[PDB]
């Protein structure tokens, strides 16, 4: 599990059948609410890549390399050949979509992937409704391998075609995209996949990645199959396809989530009892490799209470190894800044984007600590220092992926970020 690659696409161009075309495996769950135009889950696929004097980008199916993103026009390339397909790198594509409702999904599985690919839509209006919104949450978690995955010019008219992408790249000052060059794709016509799908893997090296450090895992899945009227021996833990960021996860590897449910007389944070967890079962995307390489995703099977893994209320819990370097205090500070627009809908008024509502007293707060949105009532918070008030004694490592949500309607907003000391 060496390198992850993340397609990142904002509102309204389509991210279902184009995930089917070039990545192979599409994302599906139960009571899923899977998409309306683009998806709302992590679109993940299982890949083993090989190149055999061939610029094409094949799948672990070892016969052809095409897709199904258009019904009429098929340009195609030299696919490869059979013969017990090989493995250049332990790579696997992942996706991070761009609505503002998936803050759990868009904030938990984005710092844990390795390479990023930002997409530009092709089914939206002449103003840019959400181009400067859905990698600005990825701004603070500081990914490096980022590219403009240029997507749609097919049904795009000529008046809004060849220059406005530069205006989108200039409009994304809150998005780290100036060091993101362009390797284009096509969501419909998928033209000439041997160079189009080539340097999204071939140009991208390993990221800066630590081999043998602590596995300080923020988990992305905790799912379970124990419906009313179930089997007898489903003793498991977090049944997960789990992307890891740091630390080698071998058999017998140690990893701890220290608070979980907060200890007795719940106003302290730690008691010296580590959480012993031996992860043996590890599914390397088509195989059972118990020795997990850092960075890439692997199918993680832990051993904890099975009752606690049915409904994943644990989006982004810190599971870290021995040597408990995370902090112990309940007075959370941040070094924040503000979102300059109040955008997510397009208009020409500049009226809802008037100001930035700061912290107050007798007034609520919520912010995705990693992907955990807690809060409470405040007492006296100053002007330019962010003092987040909470209720959960959690020995989290670094909340360097936070989004200050704020109510204006049925949906919350985006007003802030921040980096932990």
């Amino acid at each position: 599990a060496t390198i992850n690659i993340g397609t990142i696409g904002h509102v309204a161009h389509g991210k279902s059948t184009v995930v089917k075309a070039i990545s192979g495996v599409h994302t599906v769950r139960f009571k899923n609410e899977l998409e309306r135009n683009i998806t709302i889950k992590l679109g993940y696929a299982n890949a083993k890549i090989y190149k055999l004097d061939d610029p094409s980008c094949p799948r672990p199916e070892c016969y052809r390399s095409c897709g199904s993103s258009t019904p009429d026009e098929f340009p195609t390339d030299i696919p490869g050949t059979k013969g017990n397909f090989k493995l250049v790198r332990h790579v696997s594509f992942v996706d991070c979509p761009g609505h503002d409702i998936l803050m759990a999904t868009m904030l938990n599985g984005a710092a844990v992937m390795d390479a990023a690919l930002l997409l530009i839509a092709g089914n939206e209006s002449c103003p840019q409704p959400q181009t400067s919104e859905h990698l600005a949450a990825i701004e603070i978690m500081k990914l490096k391998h980022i590219l403009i995955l240029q997507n749609k010019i097919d049904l795009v008219k000529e008046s809004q075609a060849k220059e406005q992408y530069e205006q989108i790249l200039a409009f994304v000052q809150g998005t780290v995209a100036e060091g993101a060059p362009i390797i284009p794709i096509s969501a419909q016509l998928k033209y000439n996949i041997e160079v189009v799908c080539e340097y999204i893997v071939k140009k991208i090296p390993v990221p800066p990645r630590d081999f043998t450090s602590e596995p300080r895992l923020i988990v992305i899945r905790s799912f379970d199959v124990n419906k009313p009227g179930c089997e007898v021996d489903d003793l498991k833990g977090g049944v997960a396809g789990g992307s890891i960021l740091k630390g080698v996860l071998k058999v017998g590897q140690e990893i701890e989530v220290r608070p979980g449910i907060v200890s007795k007389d719940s106003e302290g944070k730690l008691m010296c009892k580590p959480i012993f967890s031996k992860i043996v079962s590890l599914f390397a995307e088509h195989n059972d490799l118990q020795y997990a390489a850092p960075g890439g995703l692997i199918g993680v099977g832990t051993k904890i209470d099975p009752t606690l893994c049915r409904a994943d209320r644990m989006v982004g819990q810190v599971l870290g190894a021995v040597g408990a370097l995370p902090e112990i205090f309940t007075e959370l500070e941040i070094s924040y800044f503000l979102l300059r627009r109040l955008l997510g809908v397009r208009t020409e008024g500049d009226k809802k984007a008037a100001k930035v509502q700061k912290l107050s007293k007798n007034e609520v707060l919520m912010v995705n600590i990693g992907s955990l949105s807690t809060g409470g009532r405040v007492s006296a918070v100053k002007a330019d220092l962010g003092k987040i008030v909470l209720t959960n004694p959690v020995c989290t490592e670094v909340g360097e992926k936070i989004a200050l949500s704020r109510r204006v309607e049925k949906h919350w907003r985006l007003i802030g970020w921040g980096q932990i000391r």
Partner: peptide
């Protein structure tokens, strides 16, 4: 890249 200019030389002879 040669693929944008490849499309504007090759594939847009039949496309709108």
């Amino acid at each position: 890249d040669y693929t944008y200019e490849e499309l504007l030389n090759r594939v847009f002879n039949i496309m709108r």
